[PDB]
Amino acid sequence: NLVAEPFAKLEQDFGGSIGVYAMDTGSGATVSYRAEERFPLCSSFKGFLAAAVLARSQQQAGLLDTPIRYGKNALVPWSPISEKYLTTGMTVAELSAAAVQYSDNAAANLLLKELGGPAGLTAFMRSIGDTTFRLDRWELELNSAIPGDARDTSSPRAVTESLQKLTLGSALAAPQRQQFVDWLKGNTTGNHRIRAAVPADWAVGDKTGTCGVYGTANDYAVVWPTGRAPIVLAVYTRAPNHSEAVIAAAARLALEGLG
Ligand SMILES: O=C(O)C[C@@H]1CC[C@H](NC(=O)Cc2cccs2)B(O)O1
Ligand SMILES: [Li+]
Ligand code: NA
Ligand code: NA
Structure with missing residues (x-):
């Protein structure tokens, strides 16, 4: 009850649902709130997409430096990096960087094709032990975030565990x-x-997602504090059936409560 309470209040002011899972990899301590409920992945699947590409680079030499020629037909809105390199194309590694660090949508679709589609990425997540993750559609359709639809969802706990x-x-x-x-x-x-919740001399790697319904957005991260083991955590929201501030505030409570 006590640990849940500040999250329940944040959710109430926010108006929708929030889910939080955080693990201290040193002590094993955790913070949990709606951590096994499903939330839309939105662009946060693109981090796991890059990891699947990397897994294939353990088995196929030269994969990351392989150029992918693409044309204008592969572009979709919010493809800031892949629209700039339309003349020269991009390698698999370049597409992966663009998908992770700018959430580039065309790059994400190109890498999905390389891995055998949403089914291929879902199969990779199954192979590492994640039985919750599912990707079903491509960009932009996977962002619909229809309440109650399990397509293109995972849970905060499964996300954090796979991360x-x-x-x-x-x-x-x-x-x-x-x-x-x-x-x-x-x-x-x-x-x-999440980066807005951490002390300044700590380091962070993260991947965000922002869906097609205001109030449906997320972030997961690895956080390296000074002098202690990393923390892994995920914060997801679903619009009532603003978001960035709620995600940061939930991340603060997690880092403050965490043992
Ligand atoms: O990383 C996210 O936080 C941003 C990323 C953008 C592409 C994808 N979003 C859409 O295409 C709609 C959009 C929302 C906001 C900007 S564009 B995605 O789900 O999220
Ligand atoms: Li600072
Ligand atoms: Na974990
Ligand atoms: Na690993």
């Missing part, structure tokens, strides 16, 4: 893990979310 496995754990080898960590560390889209 931990892929950045700190055993689901990727060190060179791939370090590349994923570096892409998350350089993200440009998260400066009002």
Whole structure:
């Protein structure tokens, strides 16, 4: 009751639903609020998309430097990086950086095609032990965030657990893990979310998502505090059936409550 209460109040003022899961990888302590409920992934799937690309780079030499030629037909709104390199194309690594750090939509669709679609990414997440994640559609359709629709959703706990496995754990080898960590560390889209909740001399890598309904948005992150083990956490919202401030505030409560 007591730990739930500040989250329940934040949710009440916000008007919709919030879900939080945070793990201290040193002590094993956790903070949980609606952590097993489903929320739309929105663009936050693009982080796991990059990790799946990296997994394939353990088995296919040269994958990351492979150029992908694409034309104008592959572009969709919010593709700031892939619209600039239309003449030269981009490599798999370049598309992955663009998808993680700018949430580039065309880059995300191109990488999904490479992995065999939403079904292929979902299969990768199953292979690391995530039985909750599901991606069903492409950009932009996956952003619809229809209340009660399980398509293109996961839970805060499953997101955090998979993020931990892929950045700190055993689901990727060190060179791939370090590349994923570096892409998350350089993200440009998260400066009002979990990053707004952390002390300044701590380091953060994160991936955001923002869906097609105001009030449906999210962020997950690995946080490296000074002098203690990393923290992994995820904060997701669903519009009532503003968002950035709520995500930051929930992240603050998590870091403050966490053992
Ligand atoms: O990383 C996110 O926080 C931003 C990212 C943008 C692409 C995807 N969103 C859409 O295309 C609609 C949009 C909302 C806000 C800007 S564009 B996504 O779900 O989220
Ligand atoms: Li600072
Ligand atoms: Na965890
Ligand atoms: Na790993």
